[PDB]
Design a binder for this molecule. Structure first.
Ligand SMILES: *[C@@H]1O[C@H](CO)[C@@H](O[C@@H]2O[C@H](CO)[C@@H](O)[C@H](O)[C@H]2NC(C)=O)[C@H](O)[C@H]1NC(C)=O
Ligand SMILES: *[C@@H]1O[C@H](CO)[C@@H](O)[C@H](O)[C@H]1NC(C)=O
Lengths: 97, 49
């Protein structure tokens, strides 16, 4: 019988996977010790503790995460940015917006 | 039954009255609130389209 637990602690038992390069300021999907999502990775100036891995927002949405190789801090932002409005005339008149 | 009060002077008063007119216009995007930029959730939201 094996028992697991997933906390905000450094990982000890990990599956076999090869790390890749780090891409910043682009819309990518990441994988940080099994935590898979999608966002824009940017360098961050926030300060964590000596053991914690990922920070959390007010809505329990992880926005900062520490890469386990560089041991630095990264920031996650959504790929979609803001609200975009389209101004158009009628389609029977023109198609320029 | 034979008494009346008639004023002899007056005054001018300026009073305030505050009433609201409009509130803040708000818009809501269904995506990026229900499905947090994930492709697996956006394939299921179409059934609630
Ligand atoms: C009504 O009251 C006003 C004051 O609120 C009086 O005005 C005065 O009038 C006299 C002359 O009548 C002036 O010399 C004064 O300067 C005025 N002001 C004040 C503050 O005293 C007015 O006379 C009154 N009207 C009446 C009693 O018929
Ligand atoms: C291995 O991990 C260390 C410690 O986090 C890190 O400095 C290093 O870049 C990693 N990679 C290699 C190839 O040594």
């Amino acid at each position: 019988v094996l028992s697991f637990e997933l906390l905000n602690a450094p990982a000890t038992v990990c599956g076999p996977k090869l790390s890749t390069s780090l891409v910043k300021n682009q819309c990518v999907n990441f994988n940080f010790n099994g935590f898979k999502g999608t966002g824009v990775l940017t360098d961050s100036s926030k300060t964590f503790q000596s053991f914690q891995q990922f920070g959390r927002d007010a809505s329990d949405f992880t926005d900062s995460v520490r890469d386990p190789q560089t041991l630095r801090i990264l920031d996650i932002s959504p790929c979609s940015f803001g609200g975009v409005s389209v101004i158009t005339p009628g389609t029977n008149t023109s198609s320029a917006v | 039954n034979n008494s009346i009060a008639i004023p002899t002077n007056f005054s001018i008063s300026v009073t305030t009255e505050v009433m609201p007119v409009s509130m803040a216009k708000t818009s809501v995007d269904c995506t990026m609130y229900i499905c947090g930029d994930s492709l697996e959730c956006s394939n299921l939201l179409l059934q609630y389209g």
